[PDB]
């Protein structure tokens, strides 16, 4: 088959679609509509969906994987949307998860949990003990967080703040455990401000600004650069080096929203200081 895109077989059964852009989609078909097991991949070989369809709407328990390694899994609603009471955002280690109430893939109330096993397609989670509820809480131009002192579950296991070993750098960010290359370790969340705002005020104030996109800049200003005032995320604590063990990369966070992460470039040691090359 060929439309300027591409499709594979006669009536129905199990076929593959490919878009004007390289990305595949493996579906099982029934009368030309999708019904059954599907898996879609990225223009780059990356699994971005696994799960199933019924009358061309996503059905059942489906996995959506972001490029950063994080994922969303749950039984979808009648419209195929990630809305329900038993949905989870799962972190890049594929084990820590925030389970619970989500609207449209957005988190209303997520409880710390662990994904013990995918038995079939379905996954089994188990709640972790503790009072901790997490909520979608994107920061604004003036509110860095609705709960500045609730740490991020994933971060508090892989990293910590302490005196820098670098010459005169105040504090730094340390790895807590040994990790191999390409590992997310910490989140860089702050108030969202505009490039012009950052370009026009005294520059002596952009020590913690980090550009998100062509329109937005994340900053960790005011007194939130002190951990007794803010510790939700710890990214703004990594110091600079010309030969870093880490890189800034994009991240889709369930509490923070579109932000950056600190990801490792090589294996790193427990207790090793984490660095990135500032300014890209
Ligand atoms: N290689 C380096 N040498 C000296 N200061 C550094 C540095 N990398 C980062 N810094 C200080 O770290 C800043 C980035 S924010 C990283 C955290 C910071 N040192 C703190 O104590 O909160 C810059 O303002 C620079 O002053």
The whole-angstrom separation of Cα 101 and Cα 32 is: 34
195 is in an annotated binding site: no
Domain 137-279, CATH among 3.40.50.2300, 2.170.270.10, 3.90.1300.10, 3.40.50.720 = 2.170.270.10
The whole-angstrom separation of Cα 276 and Cα 83 is: 37
Give me the phi and psi of 249, to 5 degrees please: -150, 175
Task: Map 94-155 to HEC letters.
Answer: CCEEEEEEEECCEEEEEEEEEEEECCCCCCEEEECCCCCEECCCCCCCCCCCCCCCCCCHHH
Residue spans of the domains in the chain: they are 1-136, 137-279
* Choice among 91, 230, 248, 253 that is catalytic: 248
Give me the phi and psi of 10, to 5 degrees please: -65, -100
Q: Is 237 in the pocket of ligand 1 (CB under 6 A)?
A: yes
CATH 2.20.110.10 is held by the domain 1-136: yes
**Minimal CA–CA distance to 209: which of 229, 231, 230, 224?**
224
* Choice among 29, 99, 188, 224 that is catalytic: 188
Q: How was this structure determined?
A: X-ray
The whole-angstrom separation of Cα 150 and Cα 179 is: 24
The whole-angstrom separation of Cα 244 and Cα 170 is: 18
| Structure-block tokens of residue 3 | 């439309």
171 Cα: distance to centroid of ligand 1 (angstroms): 7
Long-range Cβ pairs for the range 38-47 (8 Å, 24+): 42/67, 43/19
For residue 14, the cross-strand partners are 28
- Enter the resolution in angstroms: 2.2
The whole-angstrom separation of Cα 12 and Cα 200 is: 60
For ligand 1, pick from 169, 171, 248 the residue to mutate: most ligand atoms within 8 Å of CB.
169
């Amino acid at each position: 088959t060929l439309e300027g895109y591409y499709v594979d077989d006669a009536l129905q059964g199990q076929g593959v679609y490919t878009y004007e852009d390289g990305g595949v989609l493996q579906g099982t078909y029934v009368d030309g509509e999708l019904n059954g097991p599907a898996q879609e991949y990225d223009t780059d070989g990356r699994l971005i969906f696994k799960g199933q369809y019924k009358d061309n709407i996503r059905h059942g328990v489906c996995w959506i994987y972001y490029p950063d390694g994080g994922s969303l899994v749950g039984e979808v609603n009648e419209d195929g949307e990630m809305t329900g009471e038993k949905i989870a955002y799962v972190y890049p280690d594929e084990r820590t998860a925030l389970y619970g109430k989500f609207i449209d893939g957005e988190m209303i109330e997520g409880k710390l949990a662990t994904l013990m096993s995918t038995e079939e397609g379905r996954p089994h989670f188990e709640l972790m003990p503790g009072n901790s509820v997490y909520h979608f809480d994107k920061s604004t131009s003036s509110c860095i967080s609705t709960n500045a002192l609730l740490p991020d579950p994933y971060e508090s296991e892989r990293v910590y703040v302490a005196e820098s070993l670098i010459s005169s750098a105040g504090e730094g960010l340390f790895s807590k455990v040994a990790v191999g290359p390409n590992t997310v370790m910490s989140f860089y969340n702050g108030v969202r401000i505009t490039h012009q705002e950052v370009d026009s005020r005294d520059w002596a104030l952009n020590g913690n600004t980090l550009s998100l996109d062509e329109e937005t800049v994340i900053d960790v200003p005011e007194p939130y650069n002190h951990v007794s005032k803010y510790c939700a995320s710890l990214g703004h604590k990594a110091n600079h080096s010309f030969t870093p063990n880490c890189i800034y990369d994009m991240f889709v966070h369930p509490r923070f929203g579109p932000i950056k992460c600190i990801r490792t470039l090589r294996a790193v040691e427990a207790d090793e200081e984490l660095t990135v090359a500032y300014g890209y």
